[PDB]
Amino acid sequence: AYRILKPWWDVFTDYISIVMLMIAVFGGTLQVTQDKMICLPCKWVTKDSCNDSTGPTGIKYDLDRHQYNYVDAVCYENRLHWFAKYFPYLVLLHTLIFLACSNFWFKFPRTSSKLEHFVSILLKCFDSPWTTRALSVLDKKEGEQAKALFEKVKKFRTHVEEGDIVYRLYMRQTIIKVIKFILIICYTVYYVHNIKFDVDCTVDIESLTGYRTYRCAHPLATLFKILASFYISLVIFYGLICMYTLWWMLRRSLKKYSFESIREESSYSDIPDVKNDFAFMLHLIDQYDPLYSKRFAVFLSEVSENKLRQLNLNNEWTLDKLRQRLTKNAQDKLELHLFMLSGIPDTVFDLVELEVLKLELIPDVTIPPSIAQLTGLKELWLYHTAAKIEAPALAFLRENLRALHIKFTDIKEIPLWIYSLKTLEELHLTGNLSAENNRYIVIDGLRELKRLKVLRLKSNLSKLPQVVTDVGVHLQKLSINNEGTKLIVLNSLKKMANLTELELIRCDLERIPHSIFSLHNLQEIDLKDNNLKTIEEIISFQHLHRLTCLKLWYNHIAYIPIQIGNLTNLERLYLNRNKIEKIPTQLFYCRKLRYLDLSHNNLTFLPADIGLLQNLQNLAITANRIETLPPELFQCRKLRALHLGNNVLQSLPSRVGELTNLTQIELRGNRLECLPVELGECPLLKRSGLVVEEDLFNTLPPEVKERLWRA
Amino acid sequence: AYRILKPWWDVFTDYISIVMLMIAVFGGTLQVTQDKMICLPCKWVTKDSCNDSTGPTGIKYDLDRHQYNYVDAVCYENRLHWFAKYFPYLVLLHTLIFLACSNFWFKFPRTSSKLEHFVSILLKCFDSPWTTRALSVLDKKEGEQAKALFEKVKKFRTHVEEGDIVYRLYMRQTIIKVIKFILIICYTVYYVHNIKFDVDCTVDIESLTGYRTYRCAHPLATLFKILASFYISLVIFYGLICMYTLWWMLRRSLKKYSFESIREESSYSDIPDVKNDFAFMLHLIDQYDPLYSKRFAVFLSEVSENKLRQLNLNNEWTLDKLRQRLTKNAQDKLELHLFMLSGIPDTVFDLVELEVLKLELIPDVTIPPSIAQLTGLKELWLYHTAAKIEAPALAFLRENLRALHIKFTDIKEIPLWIYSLKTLEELHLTGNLSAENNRYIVIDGLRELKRLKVLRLKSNLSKLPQVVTDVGVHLQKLSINNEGTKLIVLNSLKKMANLTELELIRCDLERIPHSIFSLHNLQEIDLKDNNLKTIEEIISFQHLHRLTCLKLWYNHIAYIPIQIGNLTNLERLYLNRNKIEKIPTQLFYCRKLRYLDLSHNNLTFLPADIGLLQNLQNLAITANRIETLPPELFQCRKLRALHLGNNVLQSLPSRVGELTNLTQIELRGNRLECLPVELGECPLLKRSGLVVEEDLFNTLPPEVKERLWRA
């Protein structure tokens, strides 16, 4: 109950008060039963006092028994000192006041309720299993019980640390006790010498008895003196204890607890100093047993909160949910996207078929060694997430990881240990690498990443790093994305010789780098969104021989150079989204063209030389002002797909019958009214495959419509 | 609660104190209700006192009742001994002091809290099920609560054994009680003869009564004498008991318990000696019942925890669980991956069928000699685990262990006794054994082994330890995986004349070492991923007459030297993932070739001399630029597998039907349009053999498709 609160001084004062109550009860009983004064008249009186002046004979006073009783009563009422007459009652009153002052805060509803809440919460935290676990690995019920206790502690903290009504009240009680003690000793010491046995009396009742002065004798005086002295000593001890209590409560700020020891002893350095009222209760409970404060300490810490949260996530995210959370990616690779789960669950490491551990805004992951259990991990994909892997897991990752995708905002965010990786081949960086001159100090780790094969720089580099040019001896792909930042080639690509795919995306070259031509093993080149106006330099590509795909996804090219005719080995030109007015036959002198993307341009007509090409598979002239489609294009076979969108009023030739290899085709955005029946002649044409407006779909013969539908 | 704490002497003293309280109450009520002195004047007196000097007649004293009362009160207050008047109060005070000094430690907060903690711990551990189990199974949840109780015991030990407050308080308590008994006896024996019936009194109040000397009679004197004598006897008994307690607490030392009895009664020799306070509290419990102490020494034990915890691992990890873990490895051998288990389970030592024992991240493992049961074990794995081991286990390893795997994060993880092995033949060490600033001292132990023939190593070694060449006398299977670091042979390889199989994985030589040439015993050679450009040194390879597999892949080989034609006994040649552009006929003159691979190269033409390769059984041109297949390839009847996908091939000659031995051909990512029917001619061919797109499969006739589906 409240025994745990009571310090040693409170127990001592309580027992002293019980002893004083015993004294008061004994004195009251004595006064009630045997308190009387025996009085005898004095025959010879001088100066209002007794002069004291055969065998001896008695002195006859000639007084009745009642006359004696009456003089006794009168002398006792008027001459006996009040202290000797009401001593036990004063002691009882003082003891009752002391007891009321000591037990007032336990009955005042506000402080009593607050301390009841405090003691209940303290006991429920003390007897919890989580605290004993904390000072010293998975359980379910204790987790939610502990999290509930943690929450209750939080609520109590806000409800009590607000203001001091318990500290303030206790402070007062002590002051009142001290001042009472002072007064009791002062008045009692002053008036303790008036308790005398022999009491001289003069009451002027001559008319009733005949004697003026009497020599009374209070037989209870000596015992009252003994009781008064013993009570004085008890009050002295009580006052000394109260003085110590007052000194203890005014030597240090009890309103400010510390919780420093546990914070700097048993880890849990996240225990803050509690404010007023709560701090007073903690200091008060320290007197009984310091272990209680340590038990309460673990529930006021943040690291304990994250440990419990982990254990909860451990129970919460069971493998079955994670197995459901498992997905497959574009590359048919099993993916598990972790989307702000505070800390990564421990259960996923038990899973074995995972391949993607994409993490995103999950602070302080600190990859556990249990990752060695999982074997299918190749790609890891840190996204705005710190990481501090442990040594064995670091070694295992060094021996197993294949792909890494680092995304971040701040430069330091990039972990150091990633450079210790030795079996890395795919590396992608997202987030500004610019260190504002004297850069690349972080990036220098790529020197030891000699096994790297493909690298990505989405970081707005004004200049290409020297580190990447050094490491590019064995490298294959530079997927560089500047998001509008102008990149200076500075002939540095000339170092790269084993390189085979290059992509300067949104790098705003405005011109061909003129250094790419030095490379002799390039096969796929991509210049997307770089404001290319005139691109004649593409003639230099005739020097290259491994080239198979020229990509110009977005630019402002106006006139296509005729010198393309020299190019022969290219296959998959994608020059869509450009200000191309017309296409010359010079592109068509090439014969190895597999894929063509003459779409989203200002083309007006199609030369018959498209049909001259005999290796085309997929074509697209979408969003072009194509008034008429030449029938000669239909000579070309092996046309798996053929895009026609947002075109002009046209008329599809019946020669579509010679499209046996057609599988997909669009006829939208162009003014058409009669789709030829020979469309059904196509053997691999599906209802969904042919994308046309519904009405044009209706213009077909009904049986042909059925044939397309069943496909 | 406190009943167990109280020994017999405490109970006896408490009952004695109750009896003295009864004495005090009786004396107090008697002295309050019939304590009065009856006094009569002495008419004839000589030297004060009372001289003792027709029918008898009463003596007339001429005193009224009130004068008698006055003289009674006066001679009671003045001429009555204080002991006779205050004997019940003195005995009441003494009994209160004795009770307070007997129950002082039950109210002082520090000692009371420590005693309550000890009582709760003893009561909990006394009802613990594991006590019985230990005193002599583990159950489901009793085991974890038992663990908690063991852990709580540890916290209580660390909390209470640092001080000696309880022992000092009991010392002072007994000392003070003994002093009080001595003082009580000394003062009461001296002042007990003054309690008398006849009390002569002279008070000099003649001026009020007329008589000088009186003879009084205290009627309560005899009863008070009897009570005083009985109380003196009670105090004598109390003091004797207190002196016995003092002698018991002074004999031997109460701050040093032993627990030796149990350490011999039920093994558990681990139980140490408890210190101050903890020892005192236990001694008292022994004085109550030694059984309680014995049923708690179990938790104080350490092997008891190891037992409960190791058997708790049995709860987690039974023999049946190991049967589930039993898995065939790459060497179709039963293995067990103990993924940071708390410790090696005992049941694991009961699978004679086990032969591959993997220990992974299992801390502080101490291998027990029960390995004697395990005879089938031939090879074991040591990942991230330092293993302490016992001498019979060393012996068993000495005549039974065949191969050893070790991977270490740091040098100290490597056990020293591993070199004490003699029958060991394989050691595939992995870690950071480079030992910077430590040269290669750890490897020195290797010299001890003499039967080793496999020394796989991957620790980014800079140089080669000379102990390696020392063991090279019997070493024949040397594996070095420098993992991206450079190594020099430094003519050391010429020393190991018995070496017959060499590879430098990721050792980055950029040059064929000359040391290997002088050695004639080699048969398998790999220079995987060493950034090799020119390989003309293969001319010296003609001096070799046992080489049958030159595998050179993941390199930048461009030109194949003519000296290839010189060597003849080559059987397997892996040149894939290189920069080869032309295929010289010098490899074609060779007839012994059976396994050939030129995948991931810059090859567009296959010479017809492929026909003169009848020994070929598997060929790979995967991911290349060849678009015409030489028909002479089909002359190699022994050929049974082709890897020719991801090419620009567009025609399969019908002669493919002549390959009866053929089993598997993949053609995905190839420019084929009409897949020939002669493929169905192959008898061993199966649907799984044809890894080809479903469209080309449908290009097959329905009977051919049916045959493939049948397989």
Swiss-Prot record, chains A, B:
Chain ranges for the short sequence motif Di-leucine motif as given in the UniProt record: 612-613
GO biological process: aspartate transmembrane transport; cell volume homeostasis; chloride transmembrane transport; cyclic-GMP-AMP transmembrane import across plasma membrane; intracellular glucose homeostasis; intracellular signal transduction; monoatomic anion transmembrane transport; monoatomic anion transport
GO MF, any single term: cyclic-GMP-AMP transmembrane transporter activity
Extent of the LRR repeats: 305-328, 329-351, 353-374, 375-398, 399-421, 424-448, 449-471, 473-495, 496-519, 521-543, 545-567, 568-590, 592-613, 614-636, 638-659, 660-682, 684-707
Tissues in which the protein is found: Expressed in brain, kidney, ovary, lung, liver, heart, and fetal brain and liver. Found at high levels in bone marrow; lower levels are detected in peripheral blood cells. Expressed on T-cells as well as on B-lineage cells.
Cellular component terms per the entry's GO annotation: cell surface; cytoplasm; lysosomal membrane; membrane; monoatomic ion channel complex; plasma membrane
UniProt site positions, description: Required for anion selectivity: 65
Domain of life: Eukaryota
Chain segments annotated as transmembrane: 9-32, 86-104, 171-192, 223-247
Clinical disorder: Agammaglobulinemia 5, autosomal dominant: A primary immunodeficiency characterized by profoundly low or absent serum antibodies and low or absent circulating B-cells due to an early block of B-cell development. Affected individuals develop severe infections in the first years of life.
Protein name as catalogued: Volume-regulated anion channel subunit LRRC8A
Species: Homo sapiens (Human)
